């Protein structure tokens, strides 16, 4: 999914556990 | 870092989505290759109304293989082995195909329009909406990227819209890609097929209820299984925060919402055939034909 950068542990955490879309 | 809470996926949910999905996937496989087999085995049947539904089975059979296998994928093994170029494609070719049936939808409420409005009743149409649709799909395809990450010890690599990308354009689809989905592919087929089949009931006005109850339980099941999938995305871009532990209890709760609105949409590449049968005589003569022997 889209992130604010690379820092943001998080949001690219949720984009593994998201669907892909 | 830490939210006071770790991300992480109930298994009730897990075994109700995967249910949920198997049977939507059977149902819209075998539906679907059914309208196919018999528009294309029936000579009668090859017309021009009759190939832009075929269209609009085909781009709905697709969207099922593409998006379905995916995500149980996603959810019972949570890792991406595919390689990059794998899912460079993915997102081209499902956005592709949502787009096909998204204008195919629209093409065949235009048709329906023009048939109930003119009585002296589409090769470019399909070839032009087609086109159109590859297009508009270059983006992901060029867009999505992988990286890696460490997180809490585990290693890991997703595959995403990477926010550093080379051009302006391509920055500002980055930045803007949810928009555009919920602005073209959501947004703009409803109101062209509301529109189009408001046009043909009030034709019949001026010149029956079933296909009018079949074209709002056609609208109304589009509605409510595309909203949840742009409405998990939109509330992601609108009250997902940082810096502070108020984000990653959204994070876990938008995993079951686009879960539930990818199975809705499923469902709704589904539902087509079966409105065929309930509605039409035709339809229903030649699925009983098939299916039953």
């Known amino acids: 999914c889209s992130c604010s950068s ?15 879309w | 870092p830490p939210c006071q809470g770790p991300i992480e996926i109930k298994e009730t949910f897990k075994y109700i989505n995967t249910v949920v999905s198997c ?20 000579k009668c049947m090859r017309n021009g109304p009759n190939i832009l539904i075929a269209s609009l089975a085909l781009g709905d059979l697709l969207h099922i293989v593409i998006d379905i296998p995916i995500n149980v994928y996603k959810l019972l093994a949570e890792d ?9 494609l993915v997102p081209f070719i499902q956005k592709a195909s949502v787009g096909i049936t998204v204008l195919s939808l629209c093409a065949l409420s235009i048709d329906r329009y023009r048939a109930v409005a003119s009585w002296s009743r589409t090769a470019v149409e399909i070839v032009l ?35 550093v990308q080379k051009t302006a354009f391509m920055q500002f689809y980055k930045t803007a890609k949810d928009w555009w989905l919920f602005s073209f592919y959501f947004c703009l087929p409803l109101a062209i097929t509301a529109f189009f089949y408001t046009l043909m009931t009030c034709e019949m006005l001026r010149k029956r209820r079933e296909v009018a109850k079949t074209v709002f339980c056609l609208v109304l099941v589009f509605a409510l299984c595309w909203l949840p999938l742009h409405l998990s995305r939109i509330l ?12 990653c209890e959204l994070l876990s709760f938008l995993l079951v919402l686009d879960y539930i609105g990818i199975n809705m949409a499923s469902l709704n590449s589904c539902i087509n055939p079966i409105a065929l049968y309930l509605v039409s005589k035709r339809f229903k003569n030649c699925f009983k034909s098939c299916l039953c022997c």
């Open chain 2, 129 to 163: 909406i087609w086109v159109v649709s590859v297009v508009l799909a270059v983006p992901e395809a060029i867009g999505f990227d992988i990286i890696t990450m460490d997180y809490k010890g585990s290693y890991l690599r997703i595959c995403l819209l990477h926010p």
């Open chain 2, 23 to 42: 049977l939507v996937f059977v149902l819209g496989i075998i539906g679907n290759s059914t309208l196919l087999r018999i528009i294309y085995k029936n």
């Open chain 2, 80 to 88: 991406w082995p595919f390689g990059a170029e794998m899912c460079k």
């Open chain 1, 6 to 20: 690379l820092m943001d542990k998080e949001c690219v955490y949720f984009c593994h556990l998201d669907i892909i």
């Open chain 2, 236 to 247: 992601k871009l609108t009250l997902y925060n940082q810096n502070d532990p108020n984000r």
